[PDB]
Amino acid sequence: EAAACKKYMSKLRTIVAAQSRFLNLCLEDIYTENTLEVRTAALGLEELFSEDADTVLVVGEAGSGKSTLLQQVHLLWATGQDFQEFLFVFPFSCRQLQCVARPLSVMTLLFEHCCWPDVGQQDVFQFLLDHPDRILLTFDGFDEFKFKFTDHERHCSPTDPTSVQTLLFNLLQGNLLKNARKVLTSRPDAVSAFLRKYVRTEFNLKGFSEEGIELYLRKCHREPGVADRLIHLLQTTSALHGLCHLPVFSWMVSKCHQELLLQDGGSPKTTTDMYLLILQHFLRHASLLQGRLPTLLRLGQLALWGLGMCCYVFSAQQLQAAQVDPDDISLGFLVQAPLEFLHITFQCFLAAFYLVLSTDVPTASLRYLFNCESTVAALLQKTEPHNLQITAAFLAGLLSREHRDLLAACQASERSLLRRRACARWCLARSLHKHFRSIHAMPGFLWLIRSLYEMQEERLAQEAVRGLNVEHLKLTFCGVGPAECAALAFVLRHLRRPVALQLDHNSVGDIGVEQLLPCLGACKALYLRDNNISDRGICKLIEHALHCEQLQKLALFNNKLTDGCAHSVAQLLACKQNFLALRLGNNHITAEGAQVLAEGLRDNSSLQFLGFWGNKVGDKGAQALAEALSDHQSLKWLSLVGNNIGSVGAQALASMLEKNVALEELCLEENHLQDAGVCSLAEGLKRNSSLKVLKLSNNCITFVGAEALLQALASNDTILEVWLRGNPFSPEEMEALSHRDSRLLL
Ligand SMILES: Nc1ncnc2c1ncn2[C@@H]1O[C@H](COP(=O)(O)OP(=O)(O)O)[C@@H](O)[C@H]1O
């Protein structure tokens, strides 16, 4: 026999493994890379733990894989594969913890609401209090807790009862189980500033990349050629491919592969289409819509009740109160004996369905979905804003023209649908004006855009944007995937004033670029830094850009561009006589790409800013750019920082400085120019009266280089600054430069 603490270790592993293995399909066979990103490269699950404080936060939209991530953390731990530093892992569902109001202690939490030790309960708990650094607790769906002012009081006792919310507050501070690791998953709304005081690391979960989707479908589909054919479908059906970047949609696609592969279209395009397809699928396991209508309305009523009550787990009494019989439950929407909706998005969908079709819903109540007496209305007002936003988009979608006929089957009279469509339409039409006139609110902007798209009425989008005066649209770090690109394009394409569209730090990808194209003609500037865009994406962007007279700036810092975009870049530079700014830093451009693209730059007259920071254009790259820029009349700023340029390239840039009369700022930090290259440059400055800033930091330059430059600075009175910070100068050489020309910056 073994002591009580080791027995519990083994019990807990056994239970956690058993609860995490499946979701028959094994989670091990199915789990696919879903990258974690941290705000300030991007990390796999394995590095989740690579004040103080002790809490790790995983944030992501609904359906992005947060639950499935935690369940894989559990399975990996319980079977020995990763996270072995923890002797105990305690998984909790926040929506379940919310359902207990009777107070309880840490011991009751761990033992009665997770895993009961067979023997020695008190010894086990003591062991835990004594080794908290070997414990992990996970809390899935933290946004589904209801916190108060009454739950904000200190509580350091592990044995004394209190509210679950007070326990959790104090766990997060380190007042209970100090040094135990915590992992919380949450939707982006309910991460407040009070919480971040106690977070060691905050991660964002965006969804599958384009290759993730492919791996996912290969794991789920082993029958020969089926996965290939689904990938072929996605690569021919862009909007559907874009939806699958969210893991929940990849799941639905996989689930409905038969129906999707039968037709050559019309495939689902919008979010609502996808939810109707999975509804169709479930119904087939039992016109067919009409036949199960009372069920669907009973399910929808419960869903709406749940949302209004912020209740996502229903007890058998709540279920017979809402009146959902066992045939209702068998349909597939309620699961997992207290039940919950298959996913929170199905709760939202079923409530939207109820709002569109139930005779108990007054027309006017729909105004509370869009922000603008009856029980329906009272429920909507108390609903979590992020569930209302989901519900509202589904409502808009169910009321589109595509679905007139489908819904008409369910009614004796269309009068009711007419009234709800008209109301929703009225709200949507004024929603962008309403948004801007109420003074970051841009997540909310995005949901309004989503609802407009779901409605699928071109004219409504046009009305919504009429009279706006958007110049700059900032949507950094906003969860912008491919499908949000489709929604943006649908609305923004009607703008009459060119917009600076800022989508830095999202997951646009190649599919998103494609989906964005229709509104490219409405952009004066497009910022797509840090968005996983490859050569395929930019080549398509550039082809469309050639026909967009207003587009003058493109920024693509930090993507996956290689030399294979160079020809498209050369066309962009040679053919767009309007183009002002191009940022291509932190890609994989080499000397070959730079020589190719440089031909375009030679035939360009208007470009002002060209950025290559972090590529590797090298000597031959620098050479070709320099010769192409020798006669160029507009370029004012060139950056070649960190490009592995040496003396041959410095000679070329120096020969270019002899001829060029417009470049004002030349950024050469972090290369290996050396004294010889700085001598060349210095010669050039003697025949240049236009350059103002030459940056040479971190270039292996010696005092000899500084002397060559100082000599040139004696006969050049146009240059303002020459950066030499971090070069190998002795302290004595540093002292000696300080008395000489002050335009040297050290
Ligand atoms: N990493 C993943 N690998 C495979 N399937 C996943 C992954 N993440 C999510 N899924 C699938 O998508 C569904 C929705 O994801 P879920 O984790 O419930 O999202 P969230 O918890 O963020 O709302 C899951 O039930 C599962 O079918």
Helix (H, G, I), strand (E, B) or coil at 525: strand
Give the ligand 1 atom nearest the CA of 61: 22
Question: How wide is the angle at C-alpha 227 spanned by C-alphas 221 and 229, nearest 5°?
Answer: 140
What whole-number distance in Å separates Cα of residue 351 and Cα of residue 307?
8
Instruction: Report CA 483 to chain centroid distance, whole Å.
Output: 12
Q: What interhelical angle do 271-284 and 247-255 show, nearest 10?
A: 40
CATH number, domain containing residue 677: 3.80.10.10
Tokens of 702: 């010696």
What is the spatial distance between Cα 214 and Cα 227, in angstroms, rounded to a whole number? 8
The two structure tokens encoding residue 215: 């791996």
693, containing H or E segment = strand 693-695
Q: Return the SS3 of 288.
A: helix
Q: How far is CA 528 from CA 159, 239, 291, 375, 501, in A?
A: 53, 19, 48, 45, 9
Phi, psi at 34, each rounded to 5°: -145, 105
The angle formed by the CA atoms of residues 644, 645 and 651, to the nearest 5 degrees, is: 175
Query: Measuring from atom 12 of ligand 1, which residue has the nearest CA?
Result: 248
Task: Report the C-alpha gap between 544 and 513 in whole angstroms.
Answer: 11
Nearest partner of 249 among 70, 62, 445, 385, judged by Cα: 62
Query: Nearest CA to 398 among 383, 410, 380, 386?
Result: 410
DSSP, residue by residue, 117-140? -SS-HHHHHHHHHH-GGGEEEEEE
What is the chain's length? 746
| Cα–Cα distance measured from residue 41 to residue 205, given in angstroms and rounded to the nearest whole number | 14
Element (H, E) at 181: strand 181-186
Contact yes or no for 579/607 (Cβ under 8 A):
yes
Cα separation, 110 vs 127, in Å, equals 13
* Positive/negative CA dihedral, 268, 274, 280, 284: positive
Give the Å distance between the CA of 249 and the centre of ligand 1.
9
Residue 201 pairs with which residues in a beta bridge? 56
d(CA 48, CA 64): 17
Q: Distance from the CA of 247 to the center of ligand 1, in angstroms?
A: 5
User: Ligand 1 atom 27: the closest Cα is on which residue?
Assistant: 251
> How far is the centre of ligand 1, averaged over its atoms, from the C-alpha of 49 (Å)?
21
The span from the CA of 276 to the CA of 261, in Å, is 16
Q: What is the DSSP string of 638-683?
A: EE-TTS---HHHHHHHHHHHHH-SS--EEE-TTS--HHHHHHHHHH
Of 625, 608, 711, 733, residue with least CA distance to 665: 608
Residue 172 CB contacts under 8 Å (≥ 6 apart), including other chains: 53, 55, 182, 195, 198
Bond before 266 cis per omega within 30 degrees: yes
Q: Tell me, in angstroms, the distance from the centre of ligand 1 to residue 453's CA.
A: 24
**Both tokens assigned to 678:** 């700085």
Instruction: Judge contact between 642 and 613, C-beta under 8 A.
Output: yes
Please note each residue after which the chain is broken, C-to-N distance over 2.5 A, or write none.
Answer: 23, 40, 50, 286, 336, 372, 439
Name residue 526's beta-bridge partners: 501, 554
* Residue nearest atom 23 in ligand 1 by C-alpha distance: 63
Q: 292 C-alpha vs ligand 1 centroid, how far in Å? A: 28
The closest of 139, 219, 153, 220 to 184, measured between CA atoms, is 139
701's tokens? 């330059």
> What three-state secondary structure class fits 35?
coil
User: Which residue from 23, 68, 185, 253 has its CB within 8 A of the most atoms of ligand 1, so it is best to mutate?
Assistant: 68
- The b/e string for 28-49 (b: 16+ C-beta within 10 A; e otherwise) is eebbbebbbbeeeeeeebeebe
CA distances from 59 to 30, 136, 618 (A): 22, 18, 40
Quick one: which atom of ligand 1 is closest to the CA of 31?
3
Torsion of CA 176, 178, 182, 186, to 10 degrees: 60
* Cα separation of the two ends of the chain: 71
Going from the Cα of 332 to the center of ligand 1, the distance in angstroms, rounded, reads 17
Q: Using CA atoms, how far apart are residues 357 and 361, in angstroms rounded to an integer?
A: 8
- Encoded tokens for 110: 């761990």
Tokens of 71: 């369940």
Helix spans in 245-308 (H): 247-255, 257-262, 271-284, 288-291, 293-308
Calculated CA dihedral for residues 676, 677, 682, 687, nearest 10 degrees: 120
**Position in ligand 1 atom list of the atom nearest CA 205:** 22
Ligand 1 pocket, residues with Cβ under 6 angstroms: 30-32, 34, 60, 62-68, 216, 247-248, 251, 343
Contact criterion met (CB below 8 Å) for 656 and 632: no
Helices 482-492 and 458-465: crossing angle in degrees, nearest 10, is 70
**404 CA distance to ligand 1 middle (Å):** 32
Known binding-site residue numbers: 31-32, 60-68, 343
- Could you identify the residue written with the tokens 């050629």? 225
Nearest-atom number in ligand 1 for the CA of 141 is 21
Q: Helix H segments across 121-245?
A: 121-130, 164-173, 193-196, 210-220, 226-236, 238-243
8-state DSSP, 22: B
How far is 43 from 69, CA to CA, in rounded Å?
Answer: 13
How far does Cα 263 stand from its chain's mean position?
A: 32
Question: Alpha carbon of 722 to those of 72, 318, 579, 706, 742: distances in Å?
Answer: 53, 74, 29, 10, 9
Q: Which residues are annotated as a binding site for ADP?
A: 31-32, 63-68, 343
Q: Resolution limit in angstroms?
A: 2.3
Helix (H, G, I), strand (E, B) or coil at 146: coil
Calculate how far, in angstroms, residue 382's C-alpha sits from the geometric centre of ligand 1. 27
Whole-number Å distance between alpha carbons of 139 and 90? 9
* Six token digits for residue 89: 């892992």
The three-state secondary structure class of 200 is strand
Pocket probe for ligand 1: among 95, 245, 248, the residue whose CB has the most ligand atoms within 8 Å is 248
User: What is the C-alpha to C-alpha distance for residues 690 and 711, in angstroms, rounded to an integer?
Assistant: 18
CA 165 vs. chain centroid, Å, equals: 29
DSSP character at residue 268: P
Q: Is the dihedral of CA 336, 141, 166, 116 positive or negative?
A: positive
Contact between 454 and 396 under an 8 Å Cβ cutoff? The reply is yes
CA gap 300, 306 in Å, rounded: 10
- CATH number for the domain harbouring residue 199: 3.40.50.300
Residue 25: domain span: 4-206
Query: Ligand 1 test: best mutation among 251, 336, 384, most atoms within 8 Å of CB?
Result: 251
Instruction: Specify whether the CB–CB gap between 393 and 272 falls below 8 A.
Output: yes
Query: Whose C-alpha lies nearest to ligand 1, atom 15?
Result: 65
Binding residues for ATP: 60-67
CA gap 614, 617 in Å, rounded: 9
Closest CA to 490 of 542, 448, 527, 438: 448
